[PDB]
Amino acid sequence: MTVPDRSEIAGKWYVVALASNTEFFLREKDKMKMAMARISFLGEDELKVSYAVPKPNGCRKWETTFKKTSDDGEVYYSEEAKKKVEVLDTDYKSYAVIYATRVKDGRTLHMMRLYSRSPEVSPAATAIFRKLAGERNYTDEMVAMLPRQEECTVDEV
Ligand SMILES: O=C(N[C@H]1COC(=O)[C@@H](NC(=O)c2cccc(O)c2O)COC(=O)[C@@H](NC(=O)c2cccc(O)c2O)COC1=O)c1cccc(O)c1O
Ligand SMILES: CCCCC/C=C\C/C=C\C/C=C\C/C=C\CCCC(=O)O
Ligand SMILES: [Ga+3]
């Protein structure tokens, strides 16, 4: 409540560019199109967020809950989904950059994701985005920009 900005962007979050090094995912992120999502505040230490990705091979839409989210200041952690996301940069004015990391048994992973407040991409959104990726010594092929092309979409259900 003390952050009306959240309510402003909450309801629809767009993913239009990512960064990674794991070929399996990087290999595929390069083929998908822009994705959408909806986030809700359950509690500062818990929030509900949904993922919407249009996959021509088979669109996939679902919901997910984030629990025990207060570790490093404001970060989300799902004991079940063994995956956490920390607000690495968010303005909802034109873009937001977040640090996403998935850790499997014996394997750890990190990746950056660039969001857009509007289906369009601001040259600055891609640049600030690249700046961070560079700090991680990333290369173009490691970061793939995604178009607005849409085949499937989610509802305000
Ligand atoms: O390493 C990560 N994925 C793997 C492994 O995850 C998976 O294979 C599946 N996935 C989940 O079950 C999942 C369950 C719970 C939460 C999930 O996000 C799942 O994805 C399906 O996702 C996909 O096929 C693709 N995925 C998106 O397009 C996406 C688009 C926008 C937003 C997405 O989350 C997407 O996954 C590719 O994802 C992958 O290859 C990975 C890391 C860090 C953060 C991630 O989100 C990752 O997914
Ligand atoms: C918003 C989560 C969307 C989840 C589904 C889409 C992509 C999954 C990967 C990263 C998205 C996770 C969080 C979005 C970034 C910052 C949230 C700030 C919330 C706030 O400022 O209070
Ligand atoms: Ga995922």
Side-chain angles (χ1 to χ4, degrees), residues 14 16 34 94 115-122 125 148:
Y14 265 37
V16 320
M34 168 177 302
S94 47
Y115 289 62
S116 182
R117 196 68 265 284
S118 176
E120 308 183 349
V121 185
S122 192
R148 53 179 273 93

Side-chain angles (χ1 to χ4, degrees), residues 30-157:
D30 298 0
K31 74 83 233 273
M32 40 209 75
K33 318 300 196 297
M34 168 177 302
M36 5 287 192
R38 166 160 63 166
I39 191 169
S40 132
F41 261 43
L42 287 175
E44 302 295 341
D45 326 294
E46 187 190 358
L47 49 176
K48 209 179 204 198
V49 90
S50 289
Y51 300 55
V53 186
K55 195 191 193 194
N57 193 12
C59 315
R60 197 178 196 288
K61 59 191 187 71
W62 81 312
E63 190 171 42
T64 327
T65 306
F66 285 3
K67 312 198 193 190
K68 191 186 170 59
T69 72
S70 79
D71 279 7
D72 288 347
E74 289 291 345
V75 183
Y76 131 61
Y77 173 83
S78 257
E79 192 184 4
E80 295 72 20
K82 300 185 188 177
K83 192 200 304 322
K84 43 183 178 304
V85 324
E86 165 159 22
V87 40
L88 215 303
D89 218 279
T90 228
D91 188 5
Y92 315 135
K93 188 183 188 187
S94 47
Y95 56 86
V97 201
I98 179 172
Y99 184 85
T101 177
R102 185 181 80 83
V103 59
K104 199 173 184 173
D105 185 86
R107 306 181 74 160
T108 307
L109 182 63
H110 54 286
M111 41 177 294
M112 192 75 99
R113 291 181 162 281
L114 172 65
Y115 289 62
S116 182
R117 196 68 265 284
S118 176
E120 308 183 349
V121 185
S122 192
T126 331
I128 208 306
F129 174 45
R130 279 173 176 197
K131 188 183 182 194
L132 266 279
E135 294 292 341
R136 208 86 193 76
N137 305 176
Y138 272 35
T139 98
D140 61 336
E141 42 172 291
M142 317 220 81
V143 81
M145 321 288 100
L146 222 59
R148 53 179 273 93
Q149 290 178 1
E150 63 189 20
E151 300 295 341
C152 282
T153 56
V154 40
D155 174 279
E156 68 192 353
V157 277

